């Protein structure tokens, strides 16, 4: 019953519109708890879950200062990459960063991550061992050499194996009621004639937390990988998620089909049938 | 809680 802490950073240059915009959000599992937006009036890290509102004024001041420093480095980094790739100050560009840690059910470190992207594509990433880097192209290899020379890898690892685990523990305790819940999916199936020969069967999963879930179709017990549409898991907005999988079936053969739902909240997998 | 901004210039 592992858990996760993740921060997501987005820095975007706006040629023609002042400084870049810097945004960051922090999550525990699939629950967001903090946000920063340099466009907002606060100029402060702000709470987005009730169990972080406990944190005192020094936490908020310290998080704001680390965000302000991160943003200045992202600003410089947008300029450097522009030069690396012979781009112009007239173009808008995007730097994205994700890092965080996973802990087992005992609260102990399982794994850590840090990955950086430029204009929606991998730029540099910390490898699983938290000791070495993968550079996506020749520009990023320049960054790799710099980062090795200052032992950035150990710098991230110390955070990921240490402060990250410790904060994740504290937040799980302080928000124990809501973060330690597993809401199983409420499921049903709809049926929509397309033709007089075809109908859409749609298998629905609602109200589930956390978001991870698998919805598979079978035909006569054989996995149906053939006209199986499948939308992106989506938020309900109340802290739960929704997903559906649909297949097109020959009218009259609706009963040859089953929908199988696998979720963490389900003692064993559900099988649904149109009947 | 955030990592410390540092050692991350490209």
């Amino acid at each position: 019953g592992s858990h996760s802490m993740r921060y997501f950073f987005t820095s975007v240059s706006r040629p023609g519109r002042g400084e870049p915009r810097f945004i960051a959000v922090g999550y525990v599992d699939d629950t967001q708890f903090v946000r920063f937006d340099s466009d907002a009036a606060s100029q402060k890290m702000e709470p987005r879950a009730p169990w972080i509102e406990q944190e005192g004024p020094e936490y908020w001041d310290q998080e704001t200062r680390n965000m302000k420093a991160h943003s200045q480095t992202d600003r410089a980094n947008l300029g450097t990459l522009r030069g690396y790739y012979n781009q112009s100050e007239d173009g808008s560009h995007t730097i994205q960063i994700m890092y965080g840690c996973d802990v087992g059910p005992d609260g102990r470190f399982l794994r850590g991550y840090r990955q950086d992207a430029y204009d929606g594509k991998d730029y540099i990433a910390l490898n699983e061992d938290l000791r070495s880097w993968t550079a996506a192209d020749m520009a990023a290899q320049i960054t790799k050499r710099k980062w090795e020379a200052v032992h950035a890898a150990e710098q991230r690892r110390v955070y990921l194996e240490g402060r990250c685990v410790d904060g994740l523990r504290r937040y799980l305790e302080n928000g124990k009621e809501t973060l330690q819940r597993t809401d199983p999916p409420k499921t049903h199936m709809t049926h929509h004639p397309i033709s007089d020969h075809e109908a859409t069967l749609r298998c629905w999963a609602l109200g589930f937390y956390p978001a991870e879930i698998t919805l598979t179709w079978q035909r006569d017990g054989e996995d149906q990988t053939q006209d199986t549409e499948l939308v992106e898991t989506r938020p309900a907005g109340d802290g739960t998620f929704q997903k559906w999988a649909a297949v097109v079936v020959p009218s009259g053969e609706e009963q040859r089909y089953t929908c199988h739902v696998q979720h963490e909240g389900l003692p064993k997998p559900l099988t649904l049938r149109w009947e | 809680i955030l990592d410390t901004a540092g050692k991350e210039e490209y």
Epitope: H151 | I1, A5
Partner: T-cell receptor
Framework: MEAQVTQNPRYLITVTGKKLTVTCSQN?????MSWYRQDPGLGLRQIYY???????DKGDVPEGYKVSRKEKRNFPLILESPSPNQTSLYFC???????????????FGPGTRLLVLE | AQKVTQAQSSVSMPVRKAVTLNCLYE???????IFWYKQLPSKEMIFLIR?????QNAKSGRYSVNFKKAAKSVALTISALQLEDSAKYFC??????????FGDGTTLTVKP
Amino acid sequence: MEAQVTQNPRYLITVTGKKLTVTCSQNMNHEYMSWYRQDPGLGLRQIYYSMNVEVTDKGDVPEGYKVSRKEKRNFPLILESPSPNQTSLYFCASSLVSTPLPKETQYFGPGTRLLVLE
Amino acid sequence: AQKVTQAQSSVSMPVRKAVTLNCLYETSWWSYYIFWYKQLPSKEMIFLIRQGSDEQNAKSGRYSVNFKKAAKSVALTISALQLEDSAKYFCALGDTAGKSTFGDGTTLTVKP
């Protein structure tokens, strides 16, 4: 390549209200630099610190002081209008990153003895 | 509040023995470091060691920290005292973003 933080001046006697600047520099490409003042018998009180180029933050006793951080090498301490109670021993410190690893060092300059007099 | 307390203003111990310099702190910070510094009679300041709030007891050469987090107590112990260890020793607290708070220090005289 010998690591060191340099402060200039190391000793200064000055008259109240005459603007002055104490320079601090390091050639190790360190991100983190900090200013402190130590009154006799006491510990170091943080004045301003800089996590990197163009990033500054107030310490506990910023009043009557300003800093800037236009480049990694330099972190000057500016006293717009020195007063007698700014008489103190001033230290500039630097480290490669703002929260050093176990094996990394916090470097200190030699100190600046500032005396502000009528 | 934010206060670091070194309650012994001064301490003396014979050469070749060990000494423990106490440091207690109050802070609402829950992620932090503790720094120990040595100030020579010349007033030169020197970093000795830092203790992480999530780490085991820091140790380096003749220095070791007895980090007692629930008690907010981080005593520094110096073993095998030398005359060169006579100096004023400072205990300091720092956050995750470069801020720091100093105690007012403890003067150590090693007696030959």
